[PDB]
Structure 1
Amino acid sequence: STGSATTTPIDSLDDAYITPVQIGTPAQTLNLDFDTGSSDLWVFSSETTASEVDGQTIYTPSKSTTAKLLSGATWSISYGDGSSSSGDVYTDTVSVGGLTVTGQAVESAKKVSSSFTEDSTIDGLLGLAFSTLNTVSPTQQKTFFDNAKASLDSPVFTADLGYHAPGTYNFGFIDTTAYTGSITYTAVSTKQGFWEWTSTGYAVGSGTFKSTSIDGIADTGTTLLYLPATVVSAYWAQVSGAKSSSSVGGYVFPCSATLPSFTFGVGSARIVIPGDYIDFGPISTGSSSCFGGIQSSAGIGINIFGDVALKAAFVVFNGATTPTLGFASK
């Protein structure tokens, strides 16, 4: 089997991407944030605290003939940005882009943090990291990809995120029309539950390439690119008037700037992030200070190849017995 679904930016800055997901019988379609950095499929629901729902579409398990309470199971998750959600668990039929999994754990939110409530466009998350991170207790549950894997033509999914434009998530096949050149594969560590890999270095603009190992995760559910402070300082030093602002919480730059590109290494290959991808717009409406898309990972404890990096590539999440990542230009 295969599946193919379009993923759409939630706003003009590509803060995140939403992908329609069919849950239950008859189908209830919710727009979920596909997150290769987490392993819970959770949704706004008929159980969510009413004051914490503001425009999201909800899953109502009592309207699904295939929904079953997973008796005793609860979940609770915290994300790297301080946001959180928690609740109970149903099993139900979940389809993505024509690919169906029966008996998928659908984690129903009783509580969500203010950032989730305040984002009307995201109805929940679909985790695509390794199932070892799933938070369901006392019986840990599998991701949608882990449940689908054995049925798929090939045990892979691909992320093809757009710049200010829709893109695609494919499951079970590699669309050889969606990228240029060849796919370079690189080793993954699953020891922390993430798609963790080692970049071979970076360049700023037309600068020389610096060969240096950068351990980090491929995380579709993080907006920005978070790298070591040395690398980030080297990037922003090429932008007149850029600075790290403790008040704003990262590097800002004059909105009048033209940003340089950023290149990262994948083995002997190179992925170039155009400068425009690094512009996250005014810090507040009407400001001439703009927020940077490359930020320090200092204090986060891991480097994160978030959407800013991944949207520059066609990315293969290879879930073979020894997982690997693939990157191609596009």
Structure 2
Amino acid sequence: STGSATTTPIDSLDDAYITPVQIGTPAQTLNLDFDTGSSDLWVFSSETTASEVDGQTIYTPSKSTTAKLLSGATWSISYGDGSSSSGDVYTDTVSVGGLTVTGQAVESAKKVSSSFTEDSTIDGLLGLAFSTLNTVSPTQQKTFFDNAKASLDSPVFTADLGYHAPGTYNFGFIDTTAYTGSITYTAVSTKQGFWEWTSTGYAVGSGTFKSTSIDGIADTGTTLLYLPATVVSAYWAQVSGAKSSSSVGGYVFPCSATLPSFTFGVGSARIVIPGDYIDFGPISTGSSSCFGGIQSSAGIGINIFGDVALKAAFVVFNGATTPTLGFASK
């Protein structure tokens, strides 16, 4: 089997991407944030505290003839950005782009933090990291990908995120028309439950490539590119007037600037992030100070190749017995 679904930016900044997902019988379609940095499929639901729902589409398990309460199971997750959610668990039929998994754990939110409530466009998350990170207790549950894997034509999924445009998540096949050149594969460590890999270095603009190992995670659920402070300083030093603002919470730059590109290495290959991808717009409405898309990971404990990086590439999440990542230009 295979599946193929379009993923759409939630706003004009590509702050996140939503992908329609069919849950239950008859289908209830929710727009989920596919997150290769976590491993829970959770949804706003008829069980979510009413005051914490503001415009989201909800899953109502009582209206699904295939929903079953997973007795005794609860979940609770906190994300790196400080947001969180928790609740109970159903199993139900879940389909993405024509690929169907029966008996998928669908984690129904009883509580969500304010940032989820405040984002009407995201109806939940679909985790695509390794199932070892799944938070369901007392019996940990598998991700959609892990459940689907054996049925897929090839045990892979691909992320092809658009810049200011829709893109595609494919399951079970590699669309050889979706990228240019070749896909360079690189080793993955699953020890922390992430798609963790080591970039071979970077360049800023037309500058020389610096060969240096940068260990980080491929995370579709993180907006920005978080890298070591040395790398980030080298980037922003090329932008007149850019500075790190403690009050704003990162590097800002004059909105009048034209940003340089940023290149990262994948083995001997190079992925170029155009400068425009690094502009996250005014820090507040009407400001001429703009927020940068490359930020320091210093306070995080891990480097994160988020959407800013991934959307410059066609990315293969190879879930073979020994997982690997592939990157191609596009």
Same fold (TM over 0.5): yes
Do structure 1's residue 77 and structure 2's residue 77 form an aligned pair?
Answer: yes
Give the deviation of 1:136 after TM superposition: 0.1
* Rounded Cα–Cα distance in structure 1 between residues aligned with 2:48 and 2:169: 28
* Rounded Cα–Cα distance in structure 1 between residues aligned with 2:97 and 2:240: 45
Aligned to 2:168: 168
Q: Cα deviation per residue 1:254-283 (whole Å; 9 max; x = unaligned)?
A: 000000000000000000000000000000
* Rounded Cα–Cα distance in structure 2 between residues aligned with 1:64 and 1:287: 47
State TM-score, norm by structure 2: 1.00
Q: Cα deviation per residue 1:296-328 (whole Å; 9 max; x = unaligned)?
A: 000100000000000000000000000000000
Aligned to 1:214: 214
* Rounded Cα–Cα distance in structure 2 between residues aligned with 1:116 and 1:69: 24
* Rounded Cα–Cα distance in structure 2 between residues aligned with 1:236 and 1:28: 45
Q: Cα deviation per residue 1:141-197 (whole Å; 9 max; x = unaligned)?
A: 000000000000000000000000000000000000000000000000000000000
Tell me the secondary structure at the aligned position of residue 176 of structure 1. Answer: coil
Q: Structure 1 unaligned runs (5+)?
A: none
Aligned to 1:249: 249
Tell me the secondary structure at the aligned position of residue 276 of structure 1. Answer: helix
* Rounded Cα–Cα distance in structure 2 between residues aligned with 1:174 and 1:277: 25
* Rounded Cα–Cα distance in structure 2 between residues aligned with 1:4 and 1:152: 12
* Rounded Cα–Cα distance in structure 1 between residues aligned with 2:96 and 2:281: 32
Give the deviation of 1:48 after TM superposition: 0.0
* Rounded Cα–Cα distance in structure 2 between residues aligned with 1:93 and 1:211: 46
* Rounded Cα–Cα distance in structure 1 between residues aligned with 2:289 and 2:62: 48
Give the deviation of 1:40 after TM superposition: 0.0
Give the deviation of 1:70 after TM superposition: 0.1
Give the deviation of 1:248 after TM superposition: 0.1
Q: Cα deviation per residue 1:36-72 (whole Å; 9 max; x = unaligned)?
A: 0000000000000000000000000000000000000
Aligned to 2:113: 113
Aligned to 1:31: 31
Tell me the secondary structure at the aligned position of residue 147 of structure 1. Answer: helix
Q: Cα deviation per residue 1:112-164 (whole Å; 9 max; x = unaligned)?
A: 00000000000000000000000000000000000000000000000000000
Q: Cα deviation per residue 1:171-226 (whole Å; 9 max; x = unaligned)?
A: 00000000000000000000000000000000000000000000000000000000
Aligned to 2:187: 187
Give the deviation of 1:103 after TM superposition: 0.1
* Rounded Cα–Cα distance in structure 1 between residues aligned with 2:247 and 2:101: 46
Tell me the secondary structure at the aligned position of residue 177 of structure 1. Answer: coil
Tell me the secondary structure at the aligned position of residue 244 of structure 2. Answer: strand
Matches for 1:90-105 after TM superposition, within 5 Å: 90-105=90-105
Give the deviation of 1:76 after TM superposition: 0.1
* Rounded Cα–Cα distance in structure 2 between residues aligned with 1:200 and 1:231: 13
Instruction: Kindly report the root-mean-square deviation, in angstroms, between the aligned alpha carbons of the 2 structures.
Output: 0.1
Amino-acid identity (%): 100
* Rounded Cα–Cα distance in structure 2 between residues aligned with 1:284 and 1:302: 28
* Rounded Cα–Cα distance in structure 1 between residues aligned with 2:302 and 2:203: 20
How many residues align structurally? 330
* Rounded Cα–Cα distance in structure 2 between residues aligned with 1:299 and 1:204: 22
* Rounded Cα–Cα distance in structure 2 between residues aligned with 1:256 and 1:248: 18
* Rounded Cα–Cα distance in structure 1 between residues aligned with 2:118 and 2:213: 38
Aligned to 2:263: 263
* Rounded Cα–Cα distance in structure 1 between residues aligned with 2:75 and 2:295: 31
Tell me the secondary structure at the aligned position of residue 234 of structure 2. Answer: helix
Give the deviation of 1:293 after TM superposition: 0.1
Q: Structure 2 unaligned runs (5+)?
A: none
Tell me the secondary structure at the aligned position of residue 150 of structure 2. Answer: helix
Q: Cα deviation per residue 1:70-107 (whole Å; 9 max; x = unaligned)?
A: 00000000000000000000000000000000000000
After the TM superposition, which segments of 4 or more aligned residues of structure 1 sit over 2 Å from their partners?
Answer: none
* Rounded Cα–Cα distance in structure 2 between residues aligned with 1:157 and 1:39: 15
* Rounded Cα–Cα distance in structure 1 between residues aligned with 2:10 and 2:299: 28
Q: Cα deviation per residue 1:231-273 (whole Å; 9 max; x = unaligned)?
A: 0000000000000000000000000000000000000000000
* Rounded Cα–Cα distance in structure 1 between residues aligned with 2:22 and 2:256: 43
